[PDB]
Symmetry: C3
Subunit: 221 residues, 3 copies
């Protein structure tokens, strides 16, 4: 079941990528960079998840689905880049703030991987550092980044706020599932966690970009 679920995930990522490619061909005032980011996220995630489907992206240590971290260490900084470019749509870019989010995010995913490789108190030290990174990401998202979105007009700010809540709601689920699952307290079953880390990312990756791109395109007319 776990293999088939991952094949399914990868096929959905492939379909998402193709949809974003088709949209890119009639861009409606949205820059090519946004479409490129939208395509890389699912294609890379699809590849990583394909490795799990093929029985490669995991080892016994509990099962570590290490391919998930290879996925997220690329896909999640690109998602924050997407979020940051949305806030900045129609205005001056702040690449300093954007790379601040990328740095926090890459650190967050790494602490997760290290936490998964750790045992006892050490595991939760790393996990806790990852959660602290996420909180700071959310502080930036609803603080200075949102203020940039507001500086770019009511219609853009409305859209940014929607995508900001969408992203934030999904992202807090990841460390919650991690803590509950085999990598953490072990209250939730492996199969339950596998389904969560199949369904969440479909919404976090393809869902997010459908909502993000459609909203930005709608600002054209």
């Amino acid at each position: 079941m776990i293999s088939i679920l991952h094949y399914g995930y990868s096929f959905i990522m492939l379909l998402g990528a193709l949809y974003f490619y088709l949209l890119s061909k009639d861009p409606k005032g949205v820059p090519a960079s946004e479409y490129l980011i939208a395509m890389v996220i699912p294609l890379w995630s699809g590849a990583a998840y394909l490795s799990i489907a093929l029985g490669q992206g995991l080892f016994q240590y509990t099962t570590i689905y290490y391919a998930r971290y290879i996925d997220w260490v690329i896909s999640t900084p690109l998602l924050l880049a997407a979020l940051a470019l949305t806030a900045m749509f129609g205005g001056k870019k702040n690449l300093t703030l954007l790379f601040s989010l990328v740095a926090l995010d890459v650190f967050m995913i790494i602490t997760g991987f290290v936490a998964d490789l750790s045992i006892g108190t050490t595991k939760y030290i790393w996990y806790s550092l990852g959660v602290i990174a996420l909180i700071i990401i959310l502080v930036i998202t609803f603080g200075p980044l949102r203020r940039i979105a507001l500086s770019n007009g009511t219609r853009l700010a409305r859209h940014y706020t929607r995508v900001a809540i969408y992203l934030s709601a999904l992202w807090v689920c990841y460390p919650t599932a991690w803590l509950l699952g085999p990598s953490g307290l072990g209250l939730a079953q492996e199969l339950t966690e596998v389904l969560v880390f199949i369904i969440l990312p479909i919404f976090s990756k393809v869902g997010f970009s459908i909502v993000d791109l459609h909203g930005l395109r709608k600002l054209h007319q």
Copy 2:
């Protein structure tokens, strides 16, 4: 023999690097970035191949020359960057298209590594995904990227087209040799593969940049 051949490769990379450094001192309207890229490619490749010569960049799994993938994952995106900056010479840059090529290329090399670590059907799934990335790279090269080259005038477009064909011809040899060699169908002997992945990269790396830089320098006024 395999060790000595790799020492030779590294010495040629070193010579190439120094030649590009000397050219950079009298740039003839070619930007420093092009000279930097031209030097990094062979220096990094030389280092990677030196590790093979010293017996470090390979393990038994059949022999995997993993240092080749460490080489290519840096050297091949830089080569496409070089190609893209050539198309854009004299005009506005399209870094989106450039990073599209970098992303495709890094994926291509990784699928190769994963394919080399795989057995049976799984190997050829990864290989096939790598080939699909290469096809898209070539489609970009002769499609949108060439159209940018054409927007920058007759003489630049002529040069870009030459370098584009040079690169494309060499690059399709890599997945061909891979499939024929021990990593694939195993028709070719290890020594045969080692020689191909010594001679190809000399032309793909040092050869390419001699052709690319000389062509751009020839466009210089006064």
Copy 3:
């Protein structure tokens, strides 16, 4: 003692990071990028050194202990330090990102040769070490040659500051390959504990010290 020393290091990195954050809130004409770089260096290093403190960022190889977390630290922290140095030289003028990325490329190569040298034995070790030293020399040639000339093109006051930070960085950085060669990873003249203290004290000056000196100098160029 080695664990406690690393905990101490990480706490000092954390304090440095917070100080640079507070400075960033009243920037005095210094761009946000400089403050971001100043914070990333110690935070990343603190993380890497925390792994050593917890007993994770090291393994036994050739009977010697390899502190592999130091290389994970440096491969990110040292290119960011040269970026900081390069942006100082370019302060008030056109940027040269080609020269900046030249330094980043040399630096990342340097740290990798170090790691490979640490994993190597006999002549092979010193081939890698030697390539790393050659990278450092070229970095220093850039620092006192073309990069300094960019600093001079941005006026007397900036060039004076750049030269100070350039000497500060250079003096600290030549110590790293010296300690490495003398210590367990090299000739084995110096004891593990000696090396551990060197690679605790040097980086406090190389990371937090450097940025205090760099940022204070740039801020002092502001007229309020």
